[PDB]
Structures are given as C-alpha cells and as structure tokens.
C-alpha cells in the first residue's frame, strides 16, 4: 500500500523561497529514489531532480541546478524540495514520485497528489460564494439545473462539493478563470424536477489559503 | 539531455477505434536489453499515472488495450479499443540519461455523435445584490462537438466587457463538453437594464439557442 502524501498549497512572494514535503509509506523508505516533477498551469510535465534517501545522493536537471534543493529525513520518511529566488515562472503544481527498479525502467510508479505553489506579490482573498437558484420561467421541467458561483478569490486552489460530496452525479465544476488578479469559478448540478426543493441541496466551497469552508443552501427565488 | 518529441500533439478517435501515439528520442534509450522508456497517462485534476514501463510492460492495473512497443529511438503507444474513460494526455518519459525528461504530451480525445447543449441562465443571487454586485451566469452543458460561440445580449445589444468564460475537459463518461459564462456588472448597472439573454450558436440547432429573463 505505497502512499505519497504531499504538503498543502503555498503562496509566496517574488524572490522568496518555498519548501514542500512528501511523506512516504508502504515501502522501505531509504532504498528508492524520490523524484520531483513540475507542471505549470495547462503545460506539460517537467522533471526537476531526484534523491536517494539512503545516502542523500541527488541528481538535478541542468535547468534546475541551483534553484532546487532536495533533502530527505529518514526518521519521518519525508522528502523535501526547496525552491529559491522564486519568480512567477515557478508558479505551478509539483509532484513527488517514487522510482521503480531497473528491470521496470526506473518508472515512477507511485505519485503524490501534487502541491500547488503560487508565486506572487498579491495577498490571499477568500471567495464570495453565491448560490444560483433557477428562474421562475422554467416550469421546472423534466430536470432542473442549480448553480454555485465562487467569485473573487486568490490564490488557487478551491474545492467545491454538493451536499458534502454525496451529490456527485450530474455535476459540472468549471476551471477557474483569472481576471484582474482574482479567480472565479462556477459549478452546476442537474437533478430531477421532483428532487428540488423537496430535497435539500447545498454547495460547499473550501479555500485552504483563507482556511474557509462555506456552505450555501439553494432556496427557490421568492 | 535526451530530448523526447511526441507525435501528434493532439488526436481525436472514435469509440472502439485505435489510437496511435509515437515518441522519438534523440539518443538510444536502450541499455543491456532494457528500453528505459515509459508511458504516463494524466487525466484532468489528477497526478500522472504510470501506464507502460520499460516500453512494453503493463503498469499496475493497466488493461491490455494499452500496448507499448518499440526500441532504440522510436517508440509508440497504441490504445485499442479506445474507450470513453481514455480521453487524457499521454506522455513518454526516458530514464536512460543522468537527467530524466518527459515528452511534450499528446492529448487524446473521443469522437461521438452530436449532442445539443442544455442551457440554463441565472440572475444575480439575493446575497450578491445586497452586497453591491451583480453577476449573471449561463451554463451550456453536455454538448458535442466542442465548437460553440456564446454572446450576451442586454436589451438587444451585445455585451463583451465583463464576460468570463470557462470550458470543461471532455467528460470521461459521455464524451461531451460543457461551458460556463459569467457576466459581471455593478448592481447599479444591473438595475437599469430589463432583459438579459444567453445566446449560443451550435451546429445542433439552425437558430440561436436562447435562454433569457426579463426584469420588471
């Protein structure tokens, strides 16, 4: 049961440093290379470097030599990566991944969930979460679509759920859009006409940067 | 570094058909009877997933319809039959050199029958209005093909400033696309217009797809 648990999302300023962690379990920690991969928004995968926690041996991509510093702690089974002299280019999601043996092509077989890192001079802004109830001129119909607007927040990410996750079918959560320094996303949920408002529907929005978890119940207009 | 170049950059395949991706390495990836070339699959929001290792070996829980092959400097990934849940980005990756590298990635998507969008428009919420803002939201869900144009009409005049559009990646179950368009005004300007209209053009309809509401 190999599992790689990465640290939470970060917001740091230009020229500063950041250090993210990757806690490993399910295998002998000190005898498998740990890699780090960069993925900027909408871009491809980019290999940074890898470390062997047994003896601290490290190998860096030429492009990241001097910016990335990999360390490993055997007591906590945790691998770290530090990025220095941060720029906007360094804003991205960073993954950790364990490499396999040579007979397996040194393939990165287990990955962490990724850590979002935003490098910017702007500060955190909690989202405004607005429920979107339908208009009166829909006749309800065979189905009904409900909305949830998450406006004016920074930085990424946010996690949006419906009915605390129990309502997952018929959901469309849209990618966040940046505008004037703030993000906005939306989510729609489609259900049977007789489901709502007889059955309660509520969207939940979590914004780790501001440590907020907001619930907004969908009530008909009127 | 050993450079990996993939072809094509993007690909659309019908269900049940074969998808073929290629990966070309500037140097030999083999060493001692092993090809140090791996394939990864990444779906939106998720970390990459090991798909093929050592060129031709199935990853943990990877069905046989994914097939890797090749040696030296030329490798290829075949997916047959393509299934709905296989829309994703596929990368090749090499561990031969001291520094490891990824290919540029290949976006593979599904082709399916045309599907009309379900359009829904929402006026500003009571909570936003009381706060001094006013956003109008329009959802256009589960349509195909992805080509679609959306305009906002306020009392007949098109509004472009203040519009924020967002598109989902292809649905991994029904292979459709969805779009969300948000029009943001001040509460003051929202109060001095009557009809707000979400208008879309899509090949599944000969006329504009219209959802609107009239104040007052």
Which tokens go with B93?
């990756």
Question: Is residue B127 within a helix (H) or strand (E), and if so which, with residue range?
Answer: helix B126-131
How far is B166 from chain A, CA to nearest CA, in Å? Answer: 6
- Residue whose C-alpha is closest to residue A209's, from A105, A81, A84, A120: A120
Size of interface A-B (CB pairs under 8 A): 157
In B, residues 146-175, which contact A (CB 8 Å cutoff)? 164-168
- Residue whose C-alpha is closest to residue A67's, from A81, A54, A50, A51: A81
Question: What does the H/E/C string look like for A148-165?
Answer: EEEEEEECCCCEEEEHHH
CA distances from B138 to A7, A216, B182 (A): 36, 19, 6
Q: What residues of B are in contact with residue A58 (Cβ under 8 Å)?
A: none
Residue of B nearest to A185 (CA): B166
- Residue whose C-alpha is closest to residue B172's, from B18, B21, B44, B17: B44
Q: Do B54 and A105 touch (CB under 8 A)?
A: yes
- Residue whose C-alpha is closest to residue A113's, from A99, A98, A97, A100: A97
Query: CB within 8 A of B95, min separation 6: which ones?
Result: A99, A105, A106, A107, B36, B38
Query: CB within 8 A of A169, min separation 6: which ones?
Result: none
Q: Do B1 and A100 touch (CB under 8 A)?
A: no
Q: Do B91 and A44 touch (CB under 8 A)?
A: yes
**Spatial distance between the Cα atoms of A87 and A65, rounded to a whole number of angstroms:** 15
Question: Can you list the domains of chain A with their CATH numbers?
Answer: 1-122 (no CATH), 123-222 (2.60.40.10)
Which tokens go with B98?
């001291």
Q: Which residues pair with B105 in a beta bridge?
A: none
Task: Please check whether residue A32 touches B, CB under 8 A.
Answer: no
Q: Which residues pair with B12 in a beta bridge?
A: B109
- Residue whose C-alpha is closest to residue A44's, from B97, B90, B50: B90
- Largest Cα–Cα distance in chain A? 69
Q: Do B53 and A131 touch (CB under 8 A)?
A: no
Task: Please check whether residue A151 touches B, CB under 8 A.
Answer: yes
Hey, how many other C-beta atoms are within 10 angstroms of the C-beta on B114? 10
**Spatial distance between the Cα atoms of A170 and B141, rounded to a whole number of angstroms:** 10
SS3 at position A178:
strand
Query: CB within 8 A of A69, min separation 6: which ones?
Result: A81, A82, A84
Mutate to test the interface with A, among B5, B34, B47, B172 (most CBs of A within 10 A): B47
A120: cis peptide before it, omega within 30°?
Answer: no
Tell me which residue has tokens 């094509």.
B8
User: What does the radius of gyration of chain B's CA atoms come to, in whole angstroms?
Assistant: 23
Of the candidates A37, A108, A185, the beta carbon closest to that of B166 is on: A185
B145: cis peptide before it, omega within 30°?
Answer: yes
Nearest 10 degrees: Cα torsion B139, B141, B144, B150: 0
Residue of B nearest to A47 (CA): B101
Q: What is the DSSP letter of A66?
A: T
Of the candidates B34, B93, B137, the beta carbon closest to that of A147 is on: B137
Q: Do B53 and A105 touch (CB under 8 A)?
A: yes
In A, residues 183-212, which contact B (CB 8 Å cutoff)? 184-186, 188, 190
Task: Please check whether residue B178 touches A, CB under 8 A.
Answer: yes
**Spatial distance between the Cα atoms of A35 and B208, rounded to a whole number of angstroms:** 51
- Residue whose C-alpha is closest to residue B15's, from B112, B89, B106: B112
- Largest Cα–Cα distance in chain B? 78
Of the candidates B34, B101, B213, the beta carbon closest to that of A105 is on: B34
Question: Is residue B14 within a helix (H) or strand (E), and if so which, with residue range?
Answer: strand B10-14
- A108-129 burial string, b = 16+ CB within 10 Å, else e? bbbbbebbbbbbeeeeebbbbb
Q: Do A108 and B38 touch (CB under 8 A)?
A: yes
Query: CB within 8 A of B65, min separation 6: which ones?
Result: B79, B80, B81, B83
Q: Do A147 and B120 touch (CB under 8 A)?
A: yes
- Residue whose C-alpha is closest to residue B149's, from B183, B200, B204, B205: B200
**DSSP class per residue in B66-108:** EEEEEETTEEEEEESS--GGG-EEEEEEE-SSSS-EE---EEE
Q: Where in chain B is the domain with CATH 2.60.40.10?
A: 1-112, 113-216
At residue B18, what are phi and psi to the nearest 5 degrees? -95, 135
SS3 at position B147:
coil
Which segments within chain A are labelled E, that is strand? Answer: 3-6, 10-12, 18-25, 34-39, 46-52, 57-60, 68-73, 78-83, 92-99, 108-111, 115-119, 128-132, 143-153, 159-162, 171-173, 177-179, 182-192, 202-207, 212-217
**DSSP class per residue in B159-201:** E-TTEEEEEPPPPTTT--EEEEEEEEEEHHHHHT--EEEEEEE
Which tokens go with A25?
């379990």
SS3 at position A97:
strand
Q: What is the DSSP letter of A31?
A: G
**Spatial distance between the Cα atoms of A131 and A203, rounded to a whole number of angstroms:** 8
Hey, how many other C-beta atoms are within 10 angstroms of the C-beta on A41? 13
Residue A36 · residue A70 · CB < 8 Å:
yes
In B, residues 4-33, which contact A (CB 8 Å cutoff)? none
**Spatial distance between the Cα atoms of A23 and A96, rounded to a whole number of angstroms:** 9
**Spatial distance between the Cα atoms of A40 and A121, rounded to a whole number of angstroms:** 18
Indicate the class that CATH gives domain B113-216: mainly beta
Nearest 10 degrees: Cα torsion A191, A136, B211, A199: -10
- Residue whose C-alpha is closest to residue A23's, from A39, A1, A7: A7
Tell me how far apart the terminal alpha carbons of chain A are, to the nearest angstrom.
52
Tell me how far apart the terminal alpha carbons of chain B are, to the nearest angstrom.
66
Q: Do B167 and A176 touch (CB under 8 A)?
A: no
For this entry, resolution in Å reads 2.3
Query: CB within 8 A of A217, min separation 6: which ones?
Result: A131, A200, A201, A202
Which tokens go with B153?
């009409």
Q: What residues of B are in contact with residue A149 (Cβ under 8 Å)?
A: 125, 128, 135, 137, 182
Query: CB within 8 A of A79, min separation 6: which ones?
Result: A21, A22, A24, A34, A51, A53, A70, A71, A72, A73, A96
Domain B1-112: assigned CATH number: 2.60.40.10
**Spatial distance between the Cα atoms of B150 and A79, rounded to a whole number of angstroms:** 47
CA angle A137, A141, A146 (to 5 degrees): 75
């Amino acid at each position: 049961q190999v599992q790689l648990q990465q640290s939470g999302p970060e917001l740091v300023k230009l020229g500063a440093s950041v250090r993210i962690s990757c806690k490993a379990s399910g295998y002998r920690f000190s005898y498998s290379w740990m890699n780090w991969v960069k993925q900027r928004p909408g871009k491809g995968l980019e290999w940074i470097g890898r470390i062997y926690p047994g003896d601290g041996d490290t190998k860096y991509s030429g492009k990241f030599k001097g910016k990335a510093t990999l360390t490993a702690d055997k007591s906590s089974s945790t691998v770290y990566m530090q990025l220095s002299s941060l720029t906007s280019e360094d804003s991205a999601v960073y993954f950790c991944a364990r490499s396999a043996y040579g007979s397996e092509g040194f393939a990165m077989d287990y990955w962490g969930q990724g850590t979002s890192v935003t490098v910017s001079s702007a500060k955190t802004t909690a989202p405004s979460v607005f429920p979107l109830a339908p208009v009166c001129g829909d006749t309800t119909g065979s189905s009904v679509t409900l909305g949830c607007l998450v406006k004016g927040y920074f930085p990424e990410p946010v996690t949006l759920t419906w009915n605390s996750g129990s309502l997952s079918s018929g959901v469309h959560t849209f990618p966040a859009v940046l505008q004037s320094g703030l993000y906005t996303l939306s989510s729609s949920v489609t259900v049977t006409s007789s489901t709502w408002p007889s059955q309660s529907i509520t969207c939940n929005v979590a914004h780790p940067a501001s440590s907020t978890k907001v619930d907004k119940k969908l009530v008909p207009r009127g | 570094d050993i450079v990996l170049t993939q072809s094509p950059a993007s690909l659309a395949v019908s269900l049940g058909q074969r998808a073929t991706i290629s990966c070309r390495a500037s140097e030999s990836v083999d060493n001692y009877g092993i090809s140090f070339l791996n394939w990864f699959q990444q779906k939106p929001g998720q970390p990459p997933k090991l798909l093929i290792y050592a060129a031709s070996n199935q990853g943990s829980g990877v069905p046989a319809r994914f097939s890797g092959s090749g040696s030296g400097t030329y490798f290829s990934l075949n997916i047959h039959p393509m299934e709905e849940d296989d829309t994703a980005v596929y990368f090749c990756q090499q561990t031969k050199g001291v520094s490891w590298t990824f290919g540029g990635g290949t976006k593979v998507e599904i082709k399916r029958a045309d599907a009309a969008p379900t359009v829904s428009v929402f006026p500003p919420s009571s909570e936003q209005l009381t706060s001094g803002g006013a956003s109008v939201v329009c959802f256009l869900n589960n349509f195909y093909p992805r080509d679609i144009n959306v305009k906002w009409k306020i009392d007949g005049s098109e509004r472009q400033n203040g519009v924020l559009n967002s598109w989902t990646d292809q649905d991994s179950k029904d292979s459709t696309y969805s779009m969300s368009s948000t029009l943001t005004l001040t509460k003051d300007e929202y109060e001095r217009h009557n009809s707000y209209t979400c208008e879309a053009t899509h090949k599944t309809s000969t006329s504009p797809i219209v959802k609107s509401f009239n104040r007052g």
